[PDB]
Structures are given as C-alpha cells and as structure tokens.
Amino acid sequence: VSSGRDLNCVPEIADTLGAVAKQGFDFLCMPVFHPRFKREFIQEPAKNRPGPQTRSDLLLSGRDWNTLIVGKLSPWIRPDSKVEKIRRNSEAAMLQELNFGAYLGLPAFLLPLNQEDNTNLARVLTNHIHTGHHSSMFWMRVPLVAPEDLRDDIIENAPTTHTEEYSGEEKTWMWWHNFRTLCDYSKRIAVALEIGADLPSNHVIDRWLGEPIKAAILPTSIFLTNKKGFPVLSKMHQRLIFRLLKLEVQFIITGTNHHSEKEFCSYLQYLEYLSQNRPPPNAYELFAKGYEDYLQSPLQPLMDNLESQTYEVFEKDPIKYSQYQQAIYKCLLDRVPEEEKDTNVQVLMVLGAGRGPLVNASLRAAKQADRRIKLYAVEKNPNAVVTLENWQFEEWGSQVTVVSSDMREWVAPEKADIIVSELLGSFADNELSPECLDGAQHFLKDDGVSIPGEYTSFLAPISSSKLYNEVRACREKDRDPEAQFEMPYVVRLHNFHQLSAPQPCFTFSHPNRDPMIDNNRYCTLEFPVEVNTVLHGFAGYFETVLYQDITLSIRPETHSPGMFSWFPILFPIKQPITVREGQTICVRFWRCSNSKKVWYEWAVTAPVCSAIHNPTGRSYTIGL
Amino acid sequence: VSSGRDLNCVPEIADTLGAVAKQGFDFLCMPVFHPRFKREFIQEPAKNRPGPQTRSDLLLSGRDWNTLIVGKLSPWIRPDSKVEKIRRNSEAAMLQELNFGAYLGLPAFLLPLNQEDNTNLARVLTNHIHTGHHSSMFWMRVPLVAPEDLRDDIIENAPTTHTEEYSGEEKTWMWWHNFRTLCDYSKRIAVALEIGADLPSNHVIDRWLGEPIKAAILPTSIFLTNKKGFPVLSKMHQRLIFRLLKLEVQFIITGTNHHSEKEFCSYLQYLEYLSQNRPPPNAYELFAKGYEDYLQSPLQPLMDNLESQTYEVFEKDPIKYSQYQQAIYKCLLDRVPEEEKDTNVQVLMVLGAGRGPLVNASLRAAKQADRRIKLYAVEKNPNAVVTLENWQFEEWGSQVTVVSSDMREWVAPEKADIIVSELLGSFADNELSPECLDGAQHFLKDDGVSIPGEYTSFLAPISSSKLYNEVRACREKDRDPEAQFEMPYVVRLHNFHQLSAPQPCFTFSHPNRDPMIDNNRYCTLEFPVEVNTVLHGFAGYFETVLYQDITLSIRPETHSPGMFSWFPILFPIKQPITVREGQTICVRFWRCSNSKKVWYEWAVTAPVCSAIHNPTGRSYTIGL
Amino acid sequence: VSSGRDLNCVPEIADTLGAVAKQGFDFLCMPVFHPRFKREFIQEPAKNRPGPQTRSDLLLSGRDWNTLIVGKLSPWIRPDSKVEKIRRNSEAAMLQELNFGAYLGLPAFLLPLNQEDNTNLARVLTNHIHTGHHSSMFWMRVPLVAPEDLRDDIIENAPTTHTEEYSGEEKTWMWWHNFRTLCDYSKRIAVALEIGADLPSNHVIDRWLGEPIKAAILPTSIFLTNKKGFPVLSKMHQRLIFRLLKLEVQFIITGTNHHSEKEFCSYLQYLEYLSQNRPPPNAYELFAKGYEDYLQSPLQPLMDNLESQTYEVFEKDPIKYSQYQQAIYKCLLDRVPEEEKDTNVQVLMVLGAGRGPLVNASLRAAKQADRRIKLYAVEKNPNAVVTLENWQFEEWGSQVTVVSSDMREWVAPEKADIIVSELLGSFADNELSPECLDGAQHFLKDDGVSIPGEYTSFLAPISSSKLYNEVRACREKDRDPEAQFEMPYVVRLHNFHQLSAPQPCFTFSHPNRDPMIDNNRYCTLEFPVEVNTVLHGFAGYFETVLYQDITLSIRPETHSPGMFSWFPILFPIKQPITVREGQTICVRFWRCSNSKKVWYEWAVTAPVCSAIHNPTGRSYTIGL
Numbered sequence A, B, C: 001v002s003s004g005r006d007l008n009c010v011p012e013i014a015d016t017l018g019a020v021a022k023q024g025f026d027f028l029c030m031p032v033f034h035p036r037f038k039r040e041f042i043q044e045p046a047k048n049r050p051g052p053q054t055r056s057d058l059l060l061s062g063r064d065w066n067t068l069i070v071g072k073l074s075p076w077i078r079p080d081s082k083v084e085k086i087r088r089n090s091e092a093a094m095l096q097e098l099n100f101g102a103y104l105g106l107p108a109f110l111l112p113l114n115q116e117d118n119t120n121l122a123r124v125l126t127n128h129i130h131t132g133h134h135s136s137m138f139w140m141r142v143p144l145v146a147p148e149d150l151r152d153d154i155i156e157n158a159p160t161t162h163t164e165e166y167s168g169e170e171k172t173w174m175w176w177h178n179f180r181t182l183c184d185y186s187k188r189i190a191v192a193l194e195i196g197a198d199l200p201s202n203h204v205i206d207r208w209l210g211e212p213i214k215a216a217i218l219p220t221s222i223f224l225t226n227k228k229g230f231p232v233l234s235k236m237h238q239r240l241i242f243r244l245l246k247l248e249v250q251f252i253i254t255g256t257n258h259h260s261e262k263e264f265c266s267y268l269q270y271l272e273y274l275s276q277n278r279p280p281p282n283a284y285e286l287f288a289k290g291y292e293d294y295l296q297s298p299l300q301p302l303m304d305n306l307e308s309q310t311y312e313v314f315e316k317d318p319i320k321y322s323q324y325q326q327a328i329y330k331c332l333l334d335r336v337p338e339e340e341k342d343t344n345v346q347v348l349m350v351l352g353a354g355r356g357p358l359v360n361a362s363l364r365a366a367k368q369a370d371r372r373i374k375l376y377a378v379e380k381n382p383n384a385v386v387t388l389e390n391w392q393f394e395e396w397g398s399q400v401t402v403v404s405s406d407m408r409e410w411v412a413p414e415k416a417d418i419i420v421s422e423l424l425g426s427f428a429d430n431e432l433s434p435e436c437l438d439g440a441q442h443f444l445k446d447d448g449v450s451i452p453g454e455y456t457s458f459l460a461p462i463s464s465s466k467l468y469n470e471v472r473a474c475r476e477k478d479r480d481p482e483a484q485f486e487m488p489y490v491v492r493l494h495n496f497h498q499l500s501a502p503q504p505c506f507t508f509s510h511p512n513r514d515p516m517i518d519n520n521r522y523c524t525l526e527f528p529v530e531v532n533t534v535l536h537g538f539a540g541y542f543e544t545v546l547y548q549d550i551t552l553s554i555r556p557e558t559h560s561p562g563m564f565s566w567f568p569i570l571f572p573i574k575q576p577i578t579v580r581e582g583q584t585i586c587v588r589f590w591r592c593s594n595s596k597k598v599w600y601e602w603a604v605t606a607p608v609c610s611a612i613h614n615p616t617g618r619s620y621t622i623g624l
C-alpha cells in the first residue's frame, strides 16, 4: 500500500526524511516554507526582511524532490480573508509557495478547503495552472465532516445542532464541487479526503463516489486501542479503507503518536495489515485490471474488418461459447425427436462465423444432442475466411461449407432450420445485429429458429467527475470541438456512482415476423433519484435470450458469471446536470437510420433540458 | 545489432522461423501469400478459384506475427503496368495483401521501388493508410544502383553506358523522392536501402543522408571471400556499414549461401563482428544519446523562471565554467599589477547568477590570479535567489552580496570593473543577452570589461526529410495550422545533411559604445551548393569570445571539446525547396523587436522564394 | 470607365481635387507626405525637426479620403538600399506613411516595384498588414518593360542589348512574383501595371494574364498625335486597353500634358471613347456577368433534392432542350418507318424527369417526327414529383405515367425503346450519370437506345493567382486545414490563363454492353507548355453525344452556341508549381468508388510531383 507521513514540523529535512523512510513510508507531506514565517510583500520595513526566504533546494537530490515530497501551503495563507491586507499578502504568498514547488519539481502540493468560500483561492490556483505545463498535482484537503460540525458540545450558550440536516451534513462535498467548477474541472486538481473519528451517515460518504480521490488522510486520533495496546480502526472505518483501496488511493498518516507505549510505525503496520487482508479480486476484476475508466471506441465489425488479435480476445471467453453450445444443444432436441435422430439432418447457418468458435460450438452441441447437422459458415471478413477455409480443409471436412459473403447479399442454396450469430455490442444492437439478421431472415425455414431469439438494452444514470474529464480530453483537431460528448464509449466504469436502477431501453426479436419492419426506436425513461448529485452520463448494458432459459447478460444485477466479452457502454452529456434528492431524471433515446448509417440520439428533459446529442449522426454513426 | 533474414521460399512457417532464429536472426521477411500464386479478381472461371487464398494466421502466435515477421508484396503485383487487366488485378491483390498484413498485426511490410513510375503503387498505398490507424511500417525496397545500371556488358548490340551521368547515377533517389511526395511524407513510409556489389560514387550514397532509412539490405552476393573461406566485405562496404550503424538501421541478409563450405550464419557472424568493432562514441555522443532529432522549445530564462533541475543540468558542464574561470583569471591579471595586488579590490558583478556556479568560478579565478575581488550576484528568479542566499550565508560570507533584481531595473551602489554573464542561447542572442546587458551597461566603469565581450551566430542550410516530418507533426489545436514551421527548435540534429558551410549571421559586442544602439538586424546569406538535394531548413550555431583567446563554440568546425550545454537550433521552412548542384541557396534573416518582444523573421529568396516566416512574431516571440 | 489622375505635385489638396474632378476623373493618386521631404529618425539634430510632419487630415472629409484618394509612397524611401542608414530611415518612413494612410482610411496605396530585390520592402509591408485589419489595398506599381530595358541607345561605351532574351524580357513579372510569394499571396496586394511607349512581345504581356491587376497606368508620353492634334493610341495599345477593360481594371493617367494645344481632359476623353466603343458582350457573357471567378460547390442531384429555383434556372436554357428534342426526333425516325407510323408505339423513359422539360421535349419530338410514343417520367425527388403529377393531370394525360422512384430501384412494367436523361455535371460523370444509367440499363430493350449515347470529360492546366487565393480563403473551422484544395469547384473562370490545349480525360458509353462493368478510371495526361508560368490547377469541361451528330459541349473550342447550363469545373492543387517554357505538365486523375461514394483523386508528376489530392475521398465525395 502507498503511504505518506504528514508533518508540520521539519527541523532538518534529511534527518526527518530518513526517520520517515525508516518507519516504512513512501513519501513525506511537509511545509516548503516555515509554517509560522508570515511574510509581508507591500509594507516597509517588514517587506525588506533579509533572506533566505526558506531552505535550499540543494538539501535534497532532484529525484528526492520529484518522488518523496508532497508540498504544503502555509497555514496563515488566507486568500478569501475579509481583511484586504491579509488577502493581498496571501495571494502573493500562495503564488510564491506554488512557484517554489514548481521550481522543486514536486509531484503534488496540498491546499486546504476548510470553509465554504474559496473563490479567490480557486482564482489564484487557476492563474498558477495557466503559467506553464508542470503536470504536477494539486491535492485539495477536504474533510468528510466540517470542523464546525464535529466540535464538542461544551459551549453552554452556543449548543451544537442536534437536528438532522440531510443537505447540510453534505456541506464539504459542496465546498469541493464549487472549487472544481470555478477551476473548470482541471485534471491537475484532485481530492485528499480527511477521515474523522465519527464517520458521517452513508449518504454523506458515497457523495464522494465518482470524485477524483487521490489521497485519504487518517489522523492518529481516530484510531482505537486494542487489548495489546496497539492502534486499530472500528469495523466501519475498516469498510471505508477497503472501498478506498479499490480506488487505489494514497494513504496519509497525520498527527502525533497517541499510542506512546508503541512505536509510531504501528499506525502504518495496521494499515499494511488491512491492505494484505483485503477481500480478493474475482476473474473479471483480474481481467479488467488496467482497463478501469479507460475509454475505447466501440468496435464496428460490419463496417471494419477485425484484426486476428481481436478475434483471439473474443475466443478467450469460454462462458459465452458454452452458453451458445447449450442453447444449440437444447434447440436440436426440440426440433428432432429420438425416432428421427439418424434420418433428420438439421441445416445450421453460423452468420458471422469469424475464425470459427461458433462453428465448433454447433458441432459439439450436435454431438452432445446425438443429432445430425449440416453447417454453413458465413463470413464477410476475407481475412477471417482464410482461417475458416484452412480449418474446413484440415479438420471440419464436407460437413461445413465456408461462405465468403455478407449475410444480407448471400443467395443460399438451402433454407436453414437454425441460424446462429454473435453480432451483439455492449448496447446489444449497436453492431447492427437487427439489420444483418433482417437481411438473412429470408433463408430461414418458416418454423426456423434464430439464436439469439431476442435482446434488450438497458440504461442507468451515472455520476462520475473523472469520466466527464476523460471524455472532455477527447477533443480533436479538425472536427467539431464538442464531438467527443456526442458519441458512446466502451469503458470498464470504475470511479463512478450509479444514480438509479437500470431500465430497459430497446428490444429486438428474431425472426422479425412483422409486415412493417422498422428498426428505428424512441424511448422515454424516468429514473427516480434518492441522493443529491451531478449527472455526467448514462451507462448502457444488455441482456439476450439465446434459447429459452439460456441467456447472456452484462446488466449488473443479472451479469453472466465470469463472462468478460463486453464492458459497459457510456453515453456522455455535454453539460453536467445538478440533481436533488427526490427528483426524477428523465432521458429520451432514439435509434435512427438511413440506407447507409445507423445512430443514436439522446437528450435529458428532466430536472432540466440538455441539447439533443448527436443530431443526424453528425458526430457518431454506425456504417451499414 | 538488429538483424533479419529475407526469404522468398517458406515451405513450413514454424520450421523456417525456427531455423532462422537458430542462425541468430531477430526477424524474418517473407511472403504472406505464395509469391507464384497469381490471383484473378474479375474474369471467370479463375476468379472463382476455391480457397484458402493463403496459409492460416493460427500457424503463429499473435506475439510472433507482431514481432518476428516482416511481410512482403507478391512479385507479380504490378500496379503501374501498361496492361489494364494486370493493373486492376494488381490493385485488388495489393489491397488484399496489405489488408492481410494489417489483420496479422505485422510490424512492417516490404514494397519495391524497382522502376521510375510508381504513381499507382503510391495511390493504392495512400488509400490503404487512410483506412484505419495501424501504426505499422511500410519499407520501400530501393537499391543504391538501379538493376539496368548494374547489368553485365554482355549484349553485343546494346552496350552499357560508359559515360558519367551525375544526375542519372542518382536516379533511385528520385524514385524514392517522387513516391514519398505523392504519399505526402507519411511517417509510416520509410526506406529499406539495397546495397550492391559495386558501391556507387560518394555523391550517389550521401543523397540518402537525411532520408528515413529504417533497413539496409545486404545480398550474400556482395560478400568477398577471405583466406579462411568466410564471407567478408570490402573496406568501402565496411565504411558504409559503420555510417548505417550510426543511424541504428535494421540489417537484412538476402540471397542464397554463396560460401557453401561454411554455415549460412557466417554472414550474420561477420556483421555482428563489425557491430562489436565499431569506433567508440565520445562524451558528447554519450550525453546526446536519446536526444537524436528530438525537437525541443528553446528555453526563455528571461520570460520564465527556470526549474531547479534545469540549473542542475547546466551545472553538469565543467568545460563551460573552467572557460569562464580562465577568462576571469586572465582579465584580473590585466587590470591589477603585482604591486597593487594587496590594495586594489576589483568589483565583479555576476549578472544572472542562477544557483551560483559563475560566482564560484569568479572566486576560484581570483584565488588563482592572487587578486582581491568584491562580488555582486544579481538574479531575477526568486527561487534561484533561495539557493543563492543560503550559499551566501553558509559559505560565501560578506565578500558576496546577493541581489534579487532584474539587471535592467537594478540601482547599483558601486560601479563594476568586470560584469560576468551567461545569457546565451543556441543562436547566441535568442535568450536576449544583448537587451539584458544593454540595460546593465550603465553600472560598468568607463574602462570596465564585459565577459562575454562578443558573440556571433552562424547558419547552415540542411536537408532532412525526418526533421521536416517531425516539425510537421507539431501542429496544434487552437492555433494557426502552420505555426510549427514559423518557430525555432533546439535539437540534437542526427538524421540530416549539411548542404553548405556555416556562415556568420548576427554579431553583438559588450559594452555597446555606440550612440545609435539598435539590436535589430537584417542579414543576407549566400550558400553555394555542390549536390542535388531538398532544403528543409537552417541549422543555427554560435561562437563567443569570453576574454581574448578564451572562447566557447558550438559551430561544428570550432566546437569546444566536451561541452554539451547547447545543442544546435533548427529554423524550418513551410515548404521543401528543390536545389540543383551548382546552385546558390540565398536566405534572409531579420532580428526584430518592440518594447515587449524580440523575434526572428526569415525567408529563402534563391533558387526560389519562400514566404516570409514568422512575420510580426505571429507564431514565435521572445518575451522582454 | 473608372479613372484616376496620378500627380506628384499637390500645392493645395482642395484646389487640386477640384481641378481633377472637373477633368472627369473618379480619383487622385497623390503623395500623403511631400515627396522631397526626407525625414531623419535616429541622428540629431535632424531627427528633432519641428512639425507638422505633413498636412492635416482635416483638409478633406472622411468620405473624400475613403473614396477619392489613392496614397503614394515617397520616392526617396529605399528599404532595400545597400546603405544601412538609408535602409533604417526608409523602414521607419515606410511604416509612418502606411500608418498615415490607414489613419486617413485610404481605399488604396501605391508602392513601386522598380528593381529585382524588394525583400525588405515585402517584409515591412507584411508587418504593416499583420497590424490590424484595414481591408485597404496595396497597388504594386510594376512596368511591363523595366526602365533599364527601355533606355535610349545614346551611351557610346555602354550599348543596349540588341540580343533577344526570352526570359529576361519577362523580368518585371519575376519582380512581382517574388514580392507576392514573400508576402504569402495576401488578398490585399494587387498589381498597378505601367504601360510603356513600345509594348513588349506578346509572351511578355500575357505573362500577366491570371495576375490580380487592379489598375493600368497610362503615361501621357505613350500617346501619339492624330491629324486634328488630339492624343490617341496605336492599334496594339487599343487591343491591350480592350483586354484590360474585360478585367474591369481602374485606369490611371500619369505625366504632364504633351498635347499643349489641347485641354488635358483629352487623354481621358479618348480613353472614355475606347470604353464606349468596345466590342459588345454575347448572351453567355451577359448571363455569366456577376459570376466571374466566383467559386461554387458542384450540385449533387442524386444525394440532394434540388430546390424549385435550381430547376427554374436549368429550364432557362432553350438550346439544351432543343438539342434533346432534335436527338429524340432523329432516333424516332430511325426506329419506326412511315408504314409503321400509325401502329408502332415507341416506349420512352425520361430518367430523372425533374419538373418535366425533357418530357415536353420528347412530346414535341414525337409530334415533329409524326410518330407515336408512350412516356414514363421517373423522378426520385418527391418535391419535383408534385410538379410532375400536377402537369400530368392538367396537361399530359394518360400518355405520361409519372413514377416516383430511384431509377436503380424501379421495377418497370414494360421495356424501353429509348431512355432519355440529363444527369451530367460540368465534368460530365461527376453527378454519377454512369451509376444511375447502369442501374436502369436492364429495362431497356436489347436494340434499345440511350440518349445520351456517350460523354467525355476534358482537362486543361491553368494559371491563376486570383483563383488560387479564392480557393485558399475557403478554409473552414472543424475540418482539415487544406480540405478546400482537395475538392472541385464549379466556376465561371475569368482572370486566368489556359496553359495547354484541353485533352480527353474519362469516357462513358450507354448502354454499357461489357461483362466486366467498372466505372473506375485512371488517366495520365501530358500537357506541352510553351511559356514560363505557375500551375495553380486544372480546368475541366465535357462533351456529349445525344444522338449521332446531335451534341452538347462546354469544351471551349467546340462550345455549344448560347448554352449556359454548365460553367467549367476547377480542380485546384495545394501548392503552386513553377513551369518553364518547353516543359511538359504531367497530371494523373483517378475516378474511384465504393458501394456508398464516388470521388476523384489527382496528382501532378511532372515537372515536379505534388501530393496525391483527395486520397480515399477524405475531403470530397459524391454520394450514391
């Protein structure tokens, strides 16, 4: 676990660093100027105070400044002070300290958010950021519970508020939110969240869910003492540590030793014990590792010819093919009884056969069912057809006929009893499985079966300031400056908050036994929200019925165990939308088309209206 | 040394790869389709030939396709054929092979330039590149000497040309140049240069100097046989190998074994011997390693406050400070004779003292000279002033007065005998050393000395298709689309060709004892060119006189031994300019200013005119 | 005719303006500072000369400064002087005069190009332009014949060159060309061309053909004297005046009265006489008026539904429909003899019937031929179908069946004897007439006729610095910064020079009785050039065979009399290409496609290579 020591007293830098390294800490948060050394910038004689203003950069190597030191703003610096003289000396001192940090090449610098009004602090920080590049982080020190809200009820004529204030208990989140809004969501501004002795109510904690937390500050004072006299944490504090470890935050130990009989390293030893004894990660968490909140363009296997290694990645999912095999096995037994098993040969067409794993799944299914099949393997990608025709000649034989064709253009010699396909995207129909299957429908027998028989997409509103920032950074040269917000992204959503339960969006059935075949759709979804938050977009998932009870799902509540073929999809919004507890999020999604392209259009109509996203597919289309 | 085996016969892929790996090769260039398997795409019955069209992608792992295999275009593919049927089947086959390579995820693919007209080949390749991203390389197989020019004089009625054709001997360079011009200088298109038995004249070879050579092809047939019977190369071929090793090219062995008595690995063993026994690299080549053709923004120490690690990097150059010390030592002996050595105290002002290495150099110089000095250390960067004031208190004492001020604004208590500074850029005056020293001039005694006393910038025309491509790639969002060509770059020039000897551009003297002080300049330079080439820009260097014979230089012919503080500067041009042998390159450079900014403007007026670059400093300025 | 008086002596501004207005002049070119009042900017005591520096702006109204005055640079201003002092005072004086002109809001300002080296003049002008907006014009005063080349042969030891120097006689064009290249083709920089007593050879004159000439300067000294004693011009000077009137240039009279017996207004009276007695303009020149060098996007009637007024504009061309009628009339007589005239009913299908003018032309043709027809009017545009179905009901009756369908999708009840269409663009096949007709071909009888039967596109290399500047200005936000050069433009080419005779590019025939139907094409054109010039692009035209000898043409040498339906097309190049007399321009054009789009690709391969323009249709496509 990555840990740091927070100190406000550094007599000698090399000796302090050395003692802190001996305790097992990876870094030290410390003042870069003496915390009591208030400086005057305007009024004589104090403005002319002889130097040096602080200690020399030569006391540490450049590597040590770059890796072991987190800088700290002096505690007297008050840019939002009501005294003009204090405000102006504070602005000049803030710049001077931030500039010294940049001179040192510090990896991070700590600034407090200890009151509601930090407008001028924000302004001075924004001006500092727009002076060079640096890449250096700014960690905003904000507590879960404000100091005014955790004070002892020991003032006889000014008692503490014994009334529950739902939105008021959430006041420190609003201090952070206003600060980062003023600073225009800078990627360089993150949260150093300070944990208190008494944890606030759940709602107050999970307000921070999709916020960019880079560090968690643990005061030595919040630790309890166990039977042996060592510092430990309450079960609820342990639960919070485990949630923070999932976000890979850096842990900061602040304060003096409150367990005097023990060495100070015991606070860190306990933290390292919790890290070692954390619940282990599943096969999905192990596969998804490195892909957390990493944005990707959804694959378009109809418009583009997929590379060999994309097919190899699809083939690594055994759950998906064992589900397809089980579905084909069940369908073969329902179509051919025991008496006909040796005479009745079922025509099976794999539509979009890729490198052949579905062809092999159909063959294993037929051997399992003890039924006879005749296979056609249809594939438009001529590169995948090389793999197919080599497999056919070497292993499959005459039982499999490889067809190099678009399923919509193919003239079939026979009609199929069963059509098998895997043309599904993360939003089910976003790879144009309805259009492809509609075009192939005519060569399926009247009593013919399509595997999959049905699919349904799902949407859920999400809060994530990190993902909003990631999408924003996708602005490109030579295109609409807001195009990146008008397109979906395949992404393993990590640092986010799901604001309401997923609801069905669009459904498709196969075969499509309707005279007025229209794949266009318009859906209105009403999402009840139970917390105060910010809406940054919509997470999309899907569910499919392969055959009867044999299904595949990426919707979290029904997620197919151990299946990693599809990560969720993200539909962003151009502008974050404030949502109050008790309010309903209303979203409208359209599936649109012409003869050449298919696309999605979307808009929020409640609590406030957004603009219609991706009108006429100006930013994003799916090629037919 | 990175080596590859070129083969046109692969019976079994795994066995061939295995035998090639056993020989010591890092990779294999091979056909991805049988080289004799001509395919028909339009006319029946041959267009309907049963598959597979080639061997399966499943024969190797994805890692092996990505790292060990370079693909090859089939030899019958002739997109520039005069037969329409051949041209159309060739276009379809070229796309099919390039698409199979992309499907395989091949790191590189070989295409020949074996004739003058490759227009349609260029067109088909450009369309392939604009279909996805891939990042994959295209190696254009081009010989130093065309096959028509190396044929035996054995045709009685068609003799070989026994007449010297200067431009005609350079014909293969023009085949490459036209191809890459048509393809619009794609970063994905590089040269695989084929070496022949008889090397062409020097001029023909060095035509390739600043060209993007990624591979060098050595036919087994060019090797001579030594006393023991092993394959070796002529001394001239060895010279060329050593020049190619300096460019870090990949070496390709092509052809059959012509030294039958020996194992085939002997060709590679010899190559590995030459690599091991190459001339060693100097202290500059060792420092510059990793910075070859890497573009950087020139530092602006007047406008910006330099970071601690930039000062540390400056301090790593001992040659520069020992030169300054020697100059100060010589000047102190000329100003104070032996009789006055104990009474006469020389006032020395270090103007732009940074972290203090010049202050220490002045102190060492005074101890060496056995003369008395009084020091003032002037520095505008308040972060560097922290370092200075700590050094002053701990080591220097009262002998050094640290001054936190801009030298142009500073009111001096005394007048200086000597002013010492190091305000020089790679183009000498580009950090605004003239403006700074002009502003400080008034506090220098009438008989006062400035160290440096003088500096001169130099320019030389250069050819480099790699650097032109690197500059081009610096296009940014939210600025003029051609701004990147209108600014200088500090760069360790590597893959380039200097077209004419450097000539002086601008000169400055200190002190400036002229009533009409004007730092603006206008220079016309005439560069005689002795080879056929392409002008992509101008390399800039400088020379300075510290004191008398004590100098500093980055001009290559006078370069200060072991001094790495300054890399050359590059002034690009928006459009490459063709230059014929015997022609003069004429360039015009202006140094311009206003009260707030200084800048350069430049234009080529001969053999053809360019546009005036950076007019009014619209793309690049140096802040005052 | 718009005329101005050039003077270098203005004692009183109001009196001079008044006398000049009385003579009939529209404007006055005059010094804005006394032409002899040389100013010093650096050296005392002359730099401190008491003001005013010139006469007051208050002497004229703002409207008079904006409309009646063209400013003049002082004759002593020599920015390219070899004397540094002269050069620096000249730079400061040039800026001061240009700045006073901008202060006055002058519509134009005259600067001379009276020598080869104007590099510094260019630099000072470019810096002036990049200081604000102004929109104000800069007229570069350049003679047809250099003053060194028209001097009297009266120096006994320095005789005039009596040797013909083809390129040397063209030296003033190179002075202009280098100046405007340095200034980066500014839209604010134009030519004021000074005509001399002896006109140079034709080649020297027409070098200026596609150059931005805004004014023509006539010295009073070039005028001859007629019988009555009035100033007149030679027949050759009259020919040049008429060519300049076609470009709508402003005429400037310079010099003193050389016809003393006559009033000075006689020079202007003669000029006004020539303007009045100019050859009159044709019906095409009358229609095209206002469209000269105005760039337009070529219409795409397949991809877009044309507006009612676009159809109205097509219908204004009677020549086009009378040609179609004559072709149909001739074809009906060849298919049905006199004996069958009352029994044989010919099936005629108008494919892309628009608002119906071809339907009416077919009906008039059948009445003329005295033959029976059955009509089908096929139209995909449903808005045009409203017009059609109303015409059918009110006038046509049962004889015409209106079909609302794409001709490629339409299932015909009968087969056609004749298919009639007008799907041609300015480059013939650029509206996708081959694809449309190929799709409709199946419902034409075996002996069936297509009207048009054939079409051929033509290309010709052109020089036009104005059109290059117009194309350049089409850069748009949110797209490739060079996209505007990679697309054709429909344009009535005016201020240009055709460099070689038009040659055939692509040909199409209907019906397409070929098994291997491919509408893709690749053409190589070799253009012999007989003058020194700059290549800025290619003009495109077409020719079509409606039936037998009944044709339509926009190729200039065969242009259909009085037909204005199509203006030429312009294919630009990204970079201007220098071409020497005797050199060949080689161009390569490709017609490319996929299932959804058609496009052109083009490149110059000689005398130098260009990049391949519009690869993969990245900048321009024609929707299918």
Ligand SMILES: Nc1ncnc2c1ncn2[C@@H]1O[C@H](C[C@@H](N)CC[C@H](N)C(=O)O)[C@@H](O)[C@H]1O
Binding pocket: A301, A302, A305, A306, A311, A314, A315, A351, A352, A353, A354, A355, A356, A357, A358, A378, A379, A380, A381, A384, A405, A406, A407, A408, A421, A422, A423, A436
């Ligand atoms: N209309 C179409 N006609 C034929 N093949 C198609 C069509 N649309 C998509 N495909 C192919 O269907 C495949 C979809 C793949 N994502 C799945 C591959 C394979 N069935 C598997 O499960 O591994 C790709 O190989 C596409 O090239």
Ligand SMILES: Nc1ncnc2c1ncn2[C@@H]1O[C@H](C[C@@H](N)CC[C@H](N)C(=O)O)[C@@H](O)[C@H]1O
Binding pocket: B301, B302, B305, B306, B311, B314, B315, B351, B352, B353, B354, B355, B356, B357, B358, B378, B379, B380, B381, B384, B405, B406, B407, B408, B421, B422, B423, B436
């Ligand atoms: N006008 C100025 N007044 C004072 N210091 C300046 C001025 N212009 C530049 N400097 C400083 O001069 C230094 C230039 C450095 N590149 C050299 C540092 C040091 N003398 C060395 O050789 O390592 C920087 O520390 C600048 O901040």
Ligand SMILES: Nc1ncnc2c1ncn2[C@@H]1O[C@H](C[C@@H](N)CC[C@H](N)C(=O)O)[C@@H](O)[C@H]1O
Binding pocket: C301, C302, C305, C306, C311, C314, C315, C351, C352, C353, C354, C355, C356, C357, C358, C378, C379, C380, C381, C384, C405, C406, C407, C408, C421, C422, C423, C436
């Ligand atoms: N494939 C198509 N099917 C049907 N109509 C088409 C097709 N392509 C183009 N058109 C129509 O053909 C017409 C072409 C026009 N420029 C000419 C109109 C009319 N024939 C005239 O001469 O005034 C338009 O009305 C188009 O909408």
